[PDB]
Every structure is written in C-alpha cells, then in structure tokens.
Design a protein around this nucleic acid. Structure first.
Ligand SMILES: Nc1ncnc2c1ncn2[C@H]1CC[C@@H](COP(=O)(O)OP(=O)(O)OP(=O)(O)O)O1
Ligand code: SF4
Lengths: 1140, 261, 258, 259
DNA sequence: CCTTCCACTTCCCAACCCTCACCA
DNA sequence: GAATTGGTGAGGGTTGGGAAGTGGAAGG
C-alpha cells in the first residue's frame, strides 16, 4: 500500500507545483469570491487525520484574469439490493467485513422503471456503500461481483446480496451530476476554513463570459525524400503559433538560410493576422524559447489540427534528444489512450470536431478542405518533398505557409468550435477534453443520466451480450436486424421546367382535392403558422382561384405541360416521430407486465400497438447437430495463450473463444452438409407501447430538439434578410448576411448529429437503456408515411426519387403553387403558404396523428388527462430549374441515390453519391462527371439536351484513343491515378487478395515496414498490361516506382513486368489502356446513352456500344414484322381451373 | 381411380424431356379414351398438344375422367430415376392429392416407387382450325433439328418458303445470311429417310427460331417429322409415337404492317 | 531410407482421388509391414483409414518406421501425369523432407520424375474399436452409386432399413418421398452380381447423403463394396484394394433428439 | 473472280478452331499459289504462319490475288454449321464485299448457302525467317499435348534439353519439381509412334507454357508434331496438314539474362 | 466390324462474400 | 475498457452447377 500512497502523494504534489507555476493558486485561506468554472480534474487529498481521500480540483478564472483552484472532497458510492428483508443483516456483515475500507452505508428508497406496477408510485430500498477513496471501491467491488454473479446465475450473508448497481460510473461524472456543478457558469465560492467543506454555487445574474487566453500552434519538419520523417533523424525547421490574435514565429536560423522578420498576413478584413518573428540559433534554443514563452503567456486552452498524430510526439522526442522533459516543463504527457493531456490546461484538437460534427465528407477532412469550405478561402499549397529545398533557397515561402496554417487553425477554432463546444458543455457533466473526445453515444448517455438522476431513477446496469442465441425453431442465429429505410427510384433521364413533358392524370384526384380545399387551407394556416383564420382578411379570395384551377385540371387531365420541380421532406423526421408517438426505450411492454398493472381496466386507452419488420439470418444446421457438436468438443484440446503455457481443455476456453470456435465448426460442417450457409427470413411483428410511463427520455429529446429549432429559426430569418438584400442589390449587406447564414447553418447542422444519436443510441452495444423494437417502429412508420405520399403524388404527377424522408417530384405547370395572406396583426403582417405542403400535411394529419397521448395532471391523485398531438410536418423546397438522374446497366435494376439538381439561377444546388465526392475514386471519372453535369444545363430541346452532352463526353474518349498523345508527361500521373486508402494494419489484412493489399505488399519490397507499420496508409497505383492474363489484383504498380531512382525503377519494373528486353520503361507503354477505356465506357453508358434509350431517342454516342439486351429489345421494336399472339389467330373457347 | 402401365418408360421420359423447356405447368386430361395434354407457353406465342391413346398402354383403367395439375420440371426430375429400359406404372386416386409412380427393372431384380405431389391450376382452352394446309412436308427429324440449330446460330428468326420445286429456310443477321434448301427425294431408300413435299400452292412465312429450338427436343421420339403451313395462319409441327399417339406444336406467325396502312 | 515400386500404378491414382476432395491433408505411416494412413474430415464427422500391405508391392525397402505429412491436392495434381499402366516408384528419406515419384512407361521409352515437399503435421491417433456388426451387406458398386445419386435429388438424408429379406432405402422431402428395395437374391449369373446380407438383428439408421456422395468416389477401385452397421455405432463402408490392401470410411449416424 | 472447292471440309473446320484463340480478327490472302494467313497474336507475344497450296483444292480459280478481312470468331461459328462430310465451296467476286460459303451433302438432297460480310482491314507482316536449326524433334502429337498439360499443372515454364540419347523436359513450381525424358526409339515398329531426334549440338532453352498450351490446339489436325530449336533463335513448332499445307508457330524463348 | 450410349473433361455464367465511403 | 443506426454503389475473387465435346466399351 505505502508505495502507492507515496507515489500518489508525490504526483499530487508535482501537479500542484505544475499548476502553481501557471498561477492557479489554491484557495488556502478562508474567504468568499466569484469566478467562472473553466476546467476540472479528480484528485486525492489529505483529510483531518491526513488520511488520503478523493477530491476534484475545480479551476476558476476571474474577470480580471486572476485564476485559482479549489479541491472539493467527495466520497464515491454505488448501490446494492438484497433479497427480501435482509438489509440489516447484509449491512452489518458488510460494515464488520471491511472495517476501515468503507466510509458509510445507508438505506435509500428509489424508483426502478422495470419494477412491476411501478406507475402507482411504488419504490424499493437500496443500500448505498461509500468509500474513503475510489481505490477501495475499485478493490471491494471485486470481493462482491463474483458472488452476486453466481447468485444471478442461480437466480453466508453475501449470498443475500441480489444485485449491484452504478458501480462503474466515472467518479467525477458522479460528482458533477450529484452537486449540479457544470462548466461555463459564474459561481460564488466560499471557504469557511477546514471546519467545513467549500461551497460552490451558481449565480444566474451574470450573462457575459470571461475571455480566456487561447494558443494555437503548428510545426513543420525536415524529412527524407519520398518517405515520412522520423523523430530520430529529422529536426524542426519552424514553429508558428498565435495567442489571442497576436501571431509569433520561431525559425532555426542554422537550417533557414536568412533572418526572418515580422510581417502581416490577412486572409479577410476580419482576419488581420499580425505576426511577430523570433530567430533562434539552434534547435535546442528554439525549443527552449518556445517553452519559456509558453511559461510566460500561460495559456489555458491550447490547440493543434491533428495534434496527437504528429506534433506532440515529434516535439516531445526532439526535446528528449536535448534532455528537455516536456512532461515536466510544459506538463503535457501522453495518456494511456495515446492522447496528450495536461493537468493545468485544456488541449482541443479541431480534427476531433470536424470528423464528428461538421458533416463534411471524408473527402474534406483535410485542413485545407475544411477551411476552404467553412472559411471560404484557400490556405496555401506545398509539397512535403519541397519544404526542405524551399526553406533553403527561399525561406519566406515556407514561413508564409507555416504562418497560414496557424491563421487557419486559430480562426477556425474561434468561430465554429468555441461557441458550439462551450455551449454544449453547459449541459453535459464532462470536461471540455472529454466532451470533445467522447463518442456521440456516450454524451447522450450522460444527458440521460442527468435527467434520470433528477428523476431519482436508479440506473440499469450495462447490457450484457448474448452469443449464439437460438431461434425458437432451433437454428443458431447469425444476425438480427430491423428493416431499414425504404428507397425507390421510379424514373430516369432528365427533367427541366424549360421544356414540355407528357402527363396523364386520374380525374377523381382533382375532385378529391377540390372537395376539401377549404379545410386544407384552414388547417395549414392555423397549425403551421399559428395565425388564426379570424386574424386574416381575404381567406375567401384565394379559395376561389384554387377551386377554379382545380376544376380546370379536372376537365382536362391528359395534357403536355412544363414541370415544376419540388422536393417535399419531413423536418427532423425521427425525433418528431418519437415525440409524436411518445416512444421511449423503457416503455415497450408485453401483456405479462400489463397483467400486473392496476390501470389494466376496461375503457382504458393506455396501450398503443404498432408494427415493425424483424429480420434475421441463421445457419441451416439443426438444433441436434449443434448440440452434438458441442458435446463433441468436450474432448478437444487447445493451445495455451502463450507458447510456454500448458494446453487448455475445451472448458478452459472462455465463452468469447468457445462461441467463435463453435461458429467456425458449424459453418465448415454446413458448407459440406447443406447447400446454403445462411438463410435470411423476414417477419411481421407487433409491439405494445405504454403511454403513461415516465417521460424523462422523451422530454430530453424535446429539449434538445427545441435547442436545434432555435438555431433553425434564426437561419430562416437570416435567409429572408439575405433574399431581401439580394433583391435590393446591396453586395455588402449580402456579404454580411451570407456570413450569418453560413454560421447558423453550421451550428444547426452540428446539433443534428447529437440530436439523431438519440435514435441510434437505443441499439448501441452495451447501452444502459436498450431495446430493439423502438429502433424498428421509427423506421417502419417512416416507410409508411413516404409510401402514402408516393401513392398520392403518383396520381397527380411523376415521382422521380424517394429516399428515407422526402420525395423529389415534378408537378404540372397549372398547379396552385403559392398564395399570400394579409393579417390583422403587425407581429406577422403577411403570411405565405404553398399548397403542396398543406396538401401532404393534411394527409399525414388525418392518418398518423396520435389520439392516445396522455399526461399526468395531478401527482397526488394519479389522474391523467388525454390529449392529441402531431409534430410531423412536411416542408417544401424548390422550385428548381433542372433535374437529372442516371440509370443502371443491368436490365431493370433501378440505380438509386444518384442525381444532379440545379437552382433557378443556373448553378449547382445538389449533386449526390458520385465519384466527384467520394475520397479517391479515379480522377478521370471525377472530371468527366463534373463536365457532363455542367453540359446537361445547356440546350433547348430534348434532342439537344443529349446532343450537348455527347459533344463534351466525346472529348475524354478522344483523349483515351489518342493515348493522350499531347498530354503533359506529368499530367497523366494525376489524371490516371486512384488514391485509395486503408483503415487497418497490413499485418491484419494478411491473406486476402485485392489491389490495396497488393500495392501495400508492393511497397514493402521497395521501402520496408516503415511505411507498412501503421494504419492510414494511402496508395497510388496504375494497373498494367505486361503480365498478360494475370488476374487484375496482380498487376498493381504504384507510382512510388515512377518516383524512385532510375536504376531502382528499372530493377523493380523488370522484377514485376517480367520484362528483360524493354528499353522504354514508360507509363504510356505500361498502362493497360483498355481497362481505363472500359471504366470510362461503363461510366458514360450510365449517364448519357442508357438514359437516352429509356427516353425514346436515337443513340447519342456512336462510339459506345449499347448493352446486348438493350440492343435486342430496341431492334425488335424497330422492324416491320410484328409477332401476333396465338389468341388472335385461334378463338378462345373458355377458361378452366382444376383443383384437388 | 386412374391406373396405367407402360412397357418402356423411355417414351414417357422423352415426352417429359420435350415438354420441360417450353411449359412450366399443365394439367392432364385423363379419360377412358386415353390421355391428352394441351397448354400454352407463358408468352402465348405457341401452343402444345399431346395425345396418348389407351391402346398403347400395357394395361389401362380410368374409372372416371380426371384432371390434375403437374409442375413439369419437377416431374422431369423424378423420371430421371427411371432406368432407360425400366417398365413404368402410374396410379392416382380420385382426391388427386398425389400421383404414385412405380418403376420395375426388366427382370424385377429391383422396385422403385415415388409420390409426385400435385397442384391446382387455372388454364384457358383454344380452338382448332382443322383446315387443310396449302403445303405439307415430311422430313427426317434429325435433319430438321440440324437446320433449326444451325440457322438459329445465324439469327433469331427464320423465313420459310415452299414451292413445288423445293423448300427453303432462310435467315439473316449482322453477319450476313443463311439459306438451306431441300428437294424431293428422287427414290425412296426407306420411308423414314425420304423427304416428301405435297402442296396446293406455294407459301411464305416467318417465325421466331427461339420456339423451334424448344420444339426440336422431340427428335428422340421419332426419326420423322411433319410440317404443315398455310398463308397468314399458324405453322404446325407434328411428331408421332408409333403406338401411343402424337405431339404437335402450333406457332403463330409474324404479319406485316401493310394491313396497318 | 524408404523406397517402393508398384506395377499396377493406377491403384495409387484411384485410391488417392477417392480422398483428394474429402480430406485436406494427412500423415502417411510407413513401416516394414506396410504403409498405413488414418485421418478425419475437418468436419470431424467422418474417419478415413487406408492400408496397403508391403507384400503387394513390386519392391519394398523400409529400414525404419517413418511418418510424413502431405496435403493430398499436391499429390493429386502430380499423379494426374501418370498413365494408367505406368509403373510407379515412391522414394523418400527419413533424413529429409521431400517425396520423389518416378513413373516408368511400359513402352520403356518414356520416363517421368517428380519431387514434392512434405508438410509438417502431427496428429493424435487411435485405432477403430472392434464391434460385432449386427448388420452387414455386400453389394455391387454401381448399384450403391446409383442409389445415392438418385436419392440426392429427392433429398438430403437417407433412411436405411434392412433385414435378411432385403435392404430398403427411403427418403422424404418437399418434392415427394420415395423408396428403393433390394430384396435378398438367391441366385446369380456371377458373384460380381451378388447382393448378400448377413444379420444378427434388424437395423435402421439415418445418414447424411451428401457425404455418401463422397464415399461413392471409391467405386472405380472395386466391383463390390461392403457395408456394416449397428445401432448407435458408425456405419462402415469398406473397399478392398486388389490383394494388396483395403480402404474404409467410418461415419456416425444422425442423432435424433427423441 | 475467286472460287475454290474442298471435299475434306473438316480440315478447314479444324484450322479455324486452332486460329481463333491466337487472333480474333485477321486478313486472309489468296493467290494463284494458294491461300495464306500470317500474323502476330493480339498480345504480340508470338507469331503464326499458315498456308494451303492451291494444288490441294478439288477446283480452284484465282484471276487476281486478293486479301480479305475476316472476324475469325464469327467465321468459326459459321463453319460450325457445316457437316464434317459436306463439300465446302468458297467464292467471292473482286468487287464484292461478301464471301459465299456453300456446303453440299454428298446426297445432294440438301444444300446450305451462307453469305458473310467482309471487313476492310490493313495488316502488318514480314517474310518469315528460317534457319537449319541445331535440334529437330519428331513426336506423336498426343504425347506432346499430354506433356505440356502435365507441366502446366505444376508451374509456369519448362526447360527443354536435347541429347543424342533422348529429349528431356523439366520444370519447377511452388509444390514441387518434375523431369521427363523420351528416349529415341531403338527400332521403329510403326511410323506414327516413333520418337526421333536430330542433334548437331546440345541445346537448352526455357519457354512459357501458356503459348505451347495454345499451339497444341491444332492437335486434331495432324497425328505428329515437330519441334525445331536452336540457341539464340525462336522455337518453331510445326504441324504438317496432309498434302496441301502447314501450320508454323514462332515463339521466342524465355530470357534468363535478367540475373 | 460398325454404331450407339454412357462417362468423363472442359468451358461459361450467376450468385455470394470483402472492402471503403456516401446517403438517409 | 470504450464503442449511435441501416441501405447501397463499385470493383474484384471464389464456388458450384449446367451444357457441350470427345473417347471407349458395349451391343448387335
Ligand atoms: N447520424 C445518424 N444517426 C442515426 N440516424 C440517422 C443519422 N442520420 C440520419 N439518420 C436517420 C434518422 C433521421 C433520418 C432522416 O435524416 P435526414 O438527413 O433526412 O434529416 P431529418 O431528421 O429529416 O432532419 P433535416 O436534416 O431534414 O432537418 O435518417
Ligand atoms: S400500458 Fe397500460 S396496462 Fe400496460 S403497464 Fe402501462 S399503464 Fe399498465
């Protein structure tokens, strides 16, 4: 013990000196002050006996820039539950058993959601056990868990313990919840002297935040040509950093050939970027200077773009080369998770945000892309190969680059990350390091724990995992799942409002609409706008122009019209469905629990029933064969965990091993003994939801949704102001409002991920509140709604795409579109509605709306009042000028999830699923697609629509058939390259064959494991002809060899082309040209030609073959002889059926 | 009940093997006169007829006329277990739940038996012209099957022309053309090997070869085939089973737009 | 150092292909008394045993007992190259890790000469327990082969029942159940045509037909095949390899829960 | 005009079964001396030469030399429509874009006529070199076909060695290595089975088996094969086609210099 | 001595499994 | 320990089953 106690005291002292060096004086003397809570960490301190006890150091900042710490001690605890009436015996046994190891035991009544009949308000006792330190809890739980575990497996006084709860909650996440202590609030702090605990308590009086000091920095290094740098060989050239809008640079003047001086760099009038410069005479002096300037300026937040990957390990190792202990001087140490963290300050990495929250494609997680998109400017270009030469020959260009990376990192941190993270920290118990780093499911578990604690609900333990559970028909299940979002792609080709389109229409549909127009407008005005129909003057003017245009349609359904392109989707669909049905992960029930409920009375409306589709996959082996294979494994012997160990018996394997071996045995058996390894089955199931169960989860979703909706409303208002400024023509006002629009859009998007996590969380492995049904019901109702909207729209017009949320459609030019209403209240002087939304919305309202919603009226009387509610609403988007969709090469397959759409202004609005967006698909495909979509905008008739694109897309085929004759020799190395990347270590992919693994093994021969060693390897390769007929995976040649030295290139190409006699080693000879021609052909076929034959036009591209099936069906269309049916030559005598 | 015995299962095997490709299911017409089958392909271009007279069976009973539905490819499975020279027996009982089959070796060294499960079907009946046809030809069945296979390689559709001097098959495609011509056999070597043309007046027609490639699976039934053709009406092919009866296919031709004019 | 010569070399080819697909790799056992082999299918449902007596070889030299792992695909892809009348030599060193195979053509003008690498295996091995087989049958091979082939289209398991009056094979499935009877014959034109049952008490058992679709590949070894059975005991299929040896497959019956 | 007649139509059937894999589209040429074809293969690994002398045809007219672009893949499928005993007749007119193939059953009860479109191709070719090769080996073709199949089972390539006593082949690969010799026959019993060697100087060379395993496709065309080999020159594999013709494959050795 | 049937080998396509990254 | 969900495109490799082609031996 003593060694650990002394080590803990030693490090606690060291940390107290480390933060005292940064000016965070401890509140040693009694007094009362106010400050802002900026950070926290857990700690142990010495009590009135100088016994060690656990505590949390809260770090505060004052408005004058003074700073301080308080340690608050708090005794952690967890709960146990006994068998009936055993609490006094068990508590006496526990208290004698571990005397001096436990602090207090006590009996607390609490409500547990799973308890029978709990709605009455019944509750059960638990015993809390609390300890003088977390270290004794961490020990003592291991004394108990096996006993209660074996008791559970069946189900002394220890056996009377029936269960234990909350034993794994992180200590400080317990503390912040239990005391309602939260970050980014102003607090009183009062220390009475050691006779009492310290008091911390929030004051809501104060709005304005303090303005804490924040530092960003970036680095660049020497490196070997064509390979990564390494911490042994290479030395830092420059470090650039900014604090609070002042910039600084340090340069190694021994490598950098001339003195550097202060300069100013301004990406935008808002980003002024003044940079001071220091020149240092050695790497050791550069490091020392930076360490000292940090010790001077004493920042509290420090930031890097992807810091844990390169900057900290590299600068740490370069410091250790000169003996400078970065862990001592600065205080950053690499944590167990590989993350650089410090006791006295916060380290925030922007890439942990961009990855999780930005909704940028993986294509743009590069700093230059995320800055270019969010900030709207380009940071500056360098190649890692040139930095050393450029810093030698022309230092200021590398200075400019390294400064630019600083400017981008700082402003990107300030505008987007600072408001969002520090807002969110107000409601999540975690530190800013933890809230930024943690995964989206755990954050939401923290918010739910906050609410559950306020509700005084004892948590459930984490969900333990089954393996190889059986179906009731005895087959071992491979997988279970719920059927996901519905998707269909009904049409193909091109649509433009500019040119006519054929329609046909059901004449009873217009009658059905016209018979209800008034109700549709009444409901749409009153519920969506909330402006009552009494508060508006001219309601009867619009209704007659609607009815007249509907009658004009009814009398002439069949027509040719231009299309109106509109998109109809449901905002925040799955949250809104959860709310509207009052779905909660705890609330699904069976009859057996309802059989105990005292509210199970005639005339009740407490239970709701909804349907979902279960899906499973299972192996064909019988129950008998599996059980026999288990019995057969009883004789098996297995190797040890390590070569020196004794061989294990089958029963000395753990469950997590046994299940995998049984799976492998049963799969290999079935591969012989039955034809099919996996059978897939889908089944309709109905599940019952209680509508009275405690609302804490649903209320949590309500609150977070409303938080998003505030930002969404602000975005709408700023878009309105933008549109006005655009029509007025004030470019400065447009520019300002566009800045506001982008900012608020990014905020509400970022909120979208954590909001939606409330849906997915309910399935996540181990989650506390876990149930699959609620994950199904919200997918299946989301299939129903959009199916019925497909039915309704398909009669009026032509659906073109249906994803999970929202239709794209074309409507006939005469349809009602927009109406304007004049109110009697200046709060909302004018109101606008567009009819497609009201029409769909009333359809949703009639069927889906809940008429069973219940709420508790009076906690003392157990009386509930029924209500009705619907939060599901469509909202229109559009109109749009042009829409295009591709088509699949396989006959009758519908190529979903690809299209292009254009704004009325003639500029790209959306463009989805294509290689231009994916990270690293073949560059030639990206450029072809990009130009052809720009070409579809042009031309005036459906003949010319395609004829335009033909004249463009011919260019690339002409290039390929020309062997790029005039293309620059370097330009091919761009144009022909794929850029694919890998997620795992090559040592783990191992035996499998594909182009990525193959080219990584190709790299091992040339440059060895220094590249292979770790995840994130990226490849550039071309596929080559010479080993004719070798299967494609074996012809992958990386561009690295075209970059290598001539003798090494010629050696490796000889080694892999199996060519001795070749003089001209050249990519232009080496390329397997027809592979690239067929890749382009099977691209262009999907976008121009098959979309043409499906639109009744002659072949747009002479050079590209039609697929054989198409050519046959087109040719059968196009000749003078027609195949009569036999029924047209011989009379039909009658119809007969035969039955047994 | 229905009960029948056939001394040589190769006949019924060759029948099922010829029906298997063209029609998925059919229901048998069983009566004291014998058994008949008629059905139409799922694309209604062509029509199958079979007749098996009771006098060809070794023994026959049909206590009442019956119909029952069969999936023919499933029957083409089970009958692959009958030996090439086995004697075969069929039985059914009036609930028509199952068809019993039994096979016996020529020496009764072995017995094999099966229960084909039956099914329910709906089907329509077509009328029969019974006209004379302006041209008829009789031909070696293997030679017609060769003509169909080879010309089918050239293209999807065949032109027939028949005239008193001879008969011609022709076809075309992107490769070019094929023509095959037959004439009267000058003197009969044997009646199965002679080609004979009888006609009123010449005829020309066109047909989709795809169905002829399903018709020629009859070739192992007989060395002989008959073709009957008349202007602007279906072509008929006939194969004959010496004692049992006949198998015939009717194919609707292609007609020109000129009637559209 | 081991060497052996066999004039009817096709015996090695046929007996190899009757295993080529069924077992991935196995260890061959060599002694002065002969060559021996046991292995199990990686499914562990079935056991293979082979024995060749050294008396049957055209020449046999074996100075000490030896064991050697091989993966049968490698041998099979070589023995494809032997003509059916070529004389086959196997030569190996207990000092080394390769097996040499030499084919001498009876025209005495063609010779072929191959070497392949052994595999490094060792395996835990037991003899078959002797049992009083309550039922045994001798059959011509083609009848059993056709029975298993035909029944495989009806379904994926066979139920066999037998007594001194005959053996019945039966199966059931969605496409229709069926049976074959082989009643016990009393007279034959030749012993190669005889079916012959012997019984202590009747037996009935269920077998996985997609495995007998492998055990049938030994048919070209022999005109006749032997079956033996008892309740709760593996079925034995046995083939005799000319005068020089025997090949046996042992397979457990399907367990029934009831 | 051009026309020609051939009663052994099966030989013309089996020629195209050989050629179709090595070149899918090629130009024939026709002369008063006979019919010729030669080309590189599409991979340009190997070279093929074939001729049938006009003296071999049962009648033959050639008023002018001409060259015809033909898709071998299609013409092979056309020739699949002739019966093996059918007499084959070819004709084309000098202005024509079309080649006529007519097949007669000797009964004359059936005639079949086919028209195929030519295509307008121009072709790169040079007059084939030849030398008195230091080694020549004559063998029954079926044995060489089995040998090449057997070595292709084991691995990539064969080394071929000739000596006064016998001809030897050897190869190696991942699973093993293998060696074969055929001795010279001591006294020929019948000429179809004799293996015989001419040997001026020892020769050894390496060859990639893929191309021998194509050249063997002519095996049904002639009962015996000849291999002509020497240092520093392509191997020739030669088949002789009855009286009228011959088929020569030219293949360069695999090169060891890379060491 | 000649012709047919059966077995064995070769060739081709369809169906299913692997990965990464965008779409909801 | 720490870890949201399901749908689909594109490119590539593996497996198994059917059709076609040739040779042998069996039958007359
Ligand atoms: N990250 C995620 N995790 C779980 N489910 C997700 C998800 N992203 C989408 N879903 C599921 C559940 C929601 C569903 C539709 O996602 P839309 O993008 O259409 O967003 P919507 O909610 O309609 O809000 P809008 O963006 O229109 O304001 O997809
Ligand atoms: S749904 Fe109704 S009956 Fe069921 S538990 Fe809830 S209140 Fe009781």
């Amino acid at each position: 013990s003593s060694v650990s106690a002394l080590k803990r005291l030693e490090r606690s002292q060291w940390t107290d000196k480390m933060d005292l060096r940064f000016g965070f004086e401890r509140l040693k003397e009694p007094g009362e002050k106010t400050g802002w809570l900026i950070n926290m960490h857990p700690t142990e301190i010495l009590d009135e006996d100088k016994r060690l006890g656990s505590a949390v150091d809260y770090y505060f900042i004052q408005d004058d820039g003074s700073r301080f710490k308080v340690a608050l001690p708090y005794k952690p605890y967890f709960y146990i539950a006994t068998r009936k009436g055993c609490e006094r015996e068990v508590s006496s046994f526990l208290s004698k058993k571990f005397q001096g190891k436990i602090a207090k035991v006590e009996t607390v009544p609490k409500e547990d959601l799973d308890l029978p009949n709990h709605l009455v308000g019944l509750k059960r006792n638990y015993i809390r056990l609390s300890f003088h330190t977390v270290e004794d809890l961490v020990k003592v739980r291991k004394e108990i868990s096996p006993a209660v575990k074996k008791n559970r497996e069946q189900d002394d006084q220890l056996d009377n313990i029936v269960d234990m709860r909350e034993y794994d909650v992180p200590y400080h996440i317990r503390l912040s919840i239990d005391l309602k202590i939260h970050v980014a609030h102003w607090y009183n702090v009062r220390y009475r002297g050691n006779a009492f605990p310290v008091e911390i308590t929030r004051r809501d009086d104060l709005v304005e935040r303090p303005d804490p000091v924040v530092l960003a920095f970036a680095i660049a290094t020497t490196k070997l040509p064509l390979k990564f740098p390494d911490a042994e060989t290479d030395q830092i050239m420059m470090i650039s950093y900014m604090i609070d809008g002042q910039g600084y640079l340090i340069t190694n003047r021994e490598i950098v050939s001339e003195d550097i001086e202060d300069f100013e760099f301004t990406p935008k009038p808002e980003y002024e970027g003044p940079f001071c410069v220091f020149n240092e005479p050695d790497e050791a002096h550069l490091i020392q200077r930076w360490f000292e300037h940090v010790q001077e300026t004493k920042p509290t937040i420090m930031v890097t773009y992807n810091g844990d990957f390169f900057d900290w390990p590299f600068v740490e190792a370069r410091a250790a080369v000169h003996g400078l202990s970065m862990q001592q001087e600065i205080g950053f140490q690499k944590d167990s998770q590989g993350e650089y963290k410090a006791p006295q300050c916060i380290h925030m990495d922007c890439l942990r945000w961009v990855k999780r929250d930005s909704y940028l494609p993986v294509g743009s997680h590069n700093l230059k892309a995320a800055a270019k998109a969010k900030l709207g400017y380009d940071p500056v270009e360098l190649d890692p190969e040139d930095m050393c030469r450029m810093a030698t020959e022309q230092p200021q260009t590398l200075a400019t680059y390294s400064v630019s990376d600083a400017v981008a990192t700082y402003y990107l941190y300030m505008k987007y990350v600072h408001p969002f993270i520090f807002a969110l920290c107000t409601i999540i118990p975690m530190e800013p390091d933890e809230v930024l780093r943690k995964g989206s499911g755990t954050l939401c578990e923290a918010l739910l724990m906050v609410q559950a604690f306020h509700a005084n609900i004892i948590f459930p333990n984490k969900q333990e995992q089954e393996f190889n559970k059986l179906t009731d028909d005895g087959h071992v299940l491979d997988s279970e799942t719920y059927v996901g979002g519905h998707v269909e792609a009904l049409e193909s080709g091109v649509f433009r409002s500019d040119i006519p389109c054929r329609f046909r229409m059901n004449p009873a549909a217009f009658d059905f609409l016209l018979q209800r127009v008034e109700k549709t407008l009444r409901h749409a005005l009153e519920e969506e706008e909330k402006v009552p129909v009494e508060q508006v003057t001219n309601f009867e003017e619009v209704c007659d122009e609607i009815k007249s245009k509907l009658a004009s349609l009814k009398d002439v359904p069949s027509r040719i019209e231009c299309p109106l392109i509109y998109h109809l989707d449901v905002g925040a669909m799955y949250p809104n469905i959860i709310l509207t049905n009052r779905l909660q992960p705890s609330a699904m029930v069976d009859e057996a629990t309802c059989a105990a409920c005292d509210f199970n009375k005639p005339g009740a409306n407490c239970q709701r029933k909804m349907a979902w589709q279960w899906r499973g996959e299972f192996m064909p082996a019988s129950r008998s064969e599996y059980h026999r294979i288990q019995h057969q494994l009883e004789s098996e012997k297995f190797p040890p965990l390590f070569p020196e160990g004794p061989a294990r018996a089958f029963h000395e394997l753990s469950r997590e091993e046994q299940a995998k071996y049984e799976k492998r045995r049963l799969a290999d058996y079935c591969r012989k003994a039955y034809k099919k390894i996996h059978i897939t089955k889908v089944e309709e199931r109905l599940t019952t939801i209680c509508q009275r169960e405690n609302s804490f989860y649903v209320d949590t979703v309500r609150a977070f949704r409303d938080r998003r909706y505030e930002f969404k409303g602000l975005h709408k208002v700023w878009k309105k102001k933008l549109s006005a400024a655009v029509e007025v023509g004030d470019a400065a006002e447009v520019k300002r409002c566009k800045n506001m629009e982008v900012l608020y859009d990014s905020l509400q998007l970022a909120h979208k991920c954590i909001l939606n996590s409330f849906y997915g969380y309910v399935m996540r492995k181990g989650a506390r509140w876990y149930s699959m049904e609620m994950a199904g019901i919200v997918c299946f109702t989301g299939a129903n709604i959009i199916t019925q909207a497909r039915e309704l729209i398909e009669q009026i017009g032509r659906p073109l795409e249906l994803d999970t949320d929202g239709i794209w459609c074309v409507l006939p030019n005469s349809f009602p579109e927009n109406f304007v209403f004049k109110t009697t209240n200046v709060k909302k002087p004018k109101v606008t509605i567009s009819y497609p939304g009201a029409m769909l919305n009333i359809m949703v309202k009639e069927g889906f709306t809940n008429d069973q919603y219940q709420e508790l009226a009076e906690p003392s009387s157990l009386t509930y009042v029924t209500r009705s509610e619907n939060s599901i609403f469509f909202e229109v988007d559009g109109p749009y000028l042009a829409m295009i969709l591709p088509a699949s090469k396989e006959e009758g397959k519908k190529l979903k999830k690809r299209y292009a759409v254009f704004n009325e202004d003639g500029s790209l609005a959306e463009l989805k699923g294509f290689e231009v967006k994916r990270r690293g698909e073949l560059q030639l495909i990206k450029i072809f697609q990009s130009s052809v979509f720009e070409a579809f905008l042009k031309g005036s008739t459906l003949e010319e629509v395609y004829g335009s694109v033909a004249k463009v897309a011919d260019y690339w085929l002409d290039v390929l058939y020309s062997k790029a004759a005039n293309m620059p020799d370097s330009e091919l190395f761009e144009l022909i390259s794929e850029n694919r990347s890998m997620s795992r270590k090559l040592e783990d992919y191992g035996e499998q064959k594909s182009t990525s693994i193959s080219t990584a093994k190709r790299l091992a021969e040339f440059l060895g494991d220094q590249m292979v060693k770790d995840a994130g390897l990226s490849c550039r390769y071309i596929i080559s002809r010479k080993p004719e007929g070798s299967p494609v995976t074996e012809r992958a040649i990386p561009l690295a060899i075209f970059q290598a030295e001539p003798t090494v290139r010629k050696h490796f190409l000889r080694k892999w082309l199996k060519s001795s006699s070749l003089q001209d080693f050249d990519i232009r000879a080496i390329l397997d040209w027809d592979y690239y021609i067929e890749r382009l052909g099977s691209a262009i076929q999907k976008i121009i030609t098959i979309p043409a034959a499906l639109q009744q036009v002659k072949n747009p591209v002479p050079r590209v073959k039609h697929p054989d099936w198409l050519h046959k069906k087109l040719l059968e269309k196009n000749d003078v002889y027609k195949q009569k049916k036999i029924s047209e030559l011989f009379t039909l005598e009658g119809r007969r059926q035969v039955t047994m | 009940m229905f009960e029948a015995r056939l001394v040589q299962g190769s006949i019924l095997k060759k029948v099922l093997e010829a029906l298997k490709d063209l029609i998925n299911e059919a229901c048998w017409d069983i009566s004291s006169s014998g058994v008949n089958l008629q059905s139409m392909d799922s694309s209604h271009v062509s029509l199958v007829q079979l007749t098996l007279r009771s006098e060809g069976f070794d023994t026959y009973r049909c206590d009442r006329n019956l119909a029952m539905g069969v999936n023919l490819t499933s029957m083409s499975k089970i009958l692959k277990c009958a030996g090439n020279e086995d004697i075969i027996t069929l039985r059914a009982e009036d609930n028509a739940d199952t068809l019993a089959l039994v096979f016996e070796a020529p020496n009764q060294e072995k017995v094999s038996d099966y229960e084909m499960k039956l099914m329910d079907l709906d089907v329509e009946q077509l009328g029969i012209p019974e006209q004379e046809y302006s041209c008829v030809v009789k031909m070696p069945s293997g030679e017609f099957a060769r003509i169909c296979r080879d010309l089918s390689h050239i293209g999807d559709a065949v032109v027939i022309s028949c005239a008193k001097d001879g008969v011609k098959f022709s076809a075309s495609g992107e490769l070019g053309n094929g023509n095959i011509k037959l004439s009267q056999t000058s003197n009969v070597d044997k009646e199965e090997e002679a080609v004979t043309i009888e006609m009123n007046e010449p005829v020309q027609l066109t047909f989709a070869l795809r169905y002829l490639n399903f018709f020629t699976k009859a070739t192992p039934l007989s060395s002989t085939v008959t073709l009957s053709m008349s202007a602007d009406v279906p072509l008929v092919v006939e194969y004959k089973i010496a004692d049992m009866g006949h198998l015939k296919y009717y194919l609707a031709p292609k007609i020109e737009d000129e009637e559209g004019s």
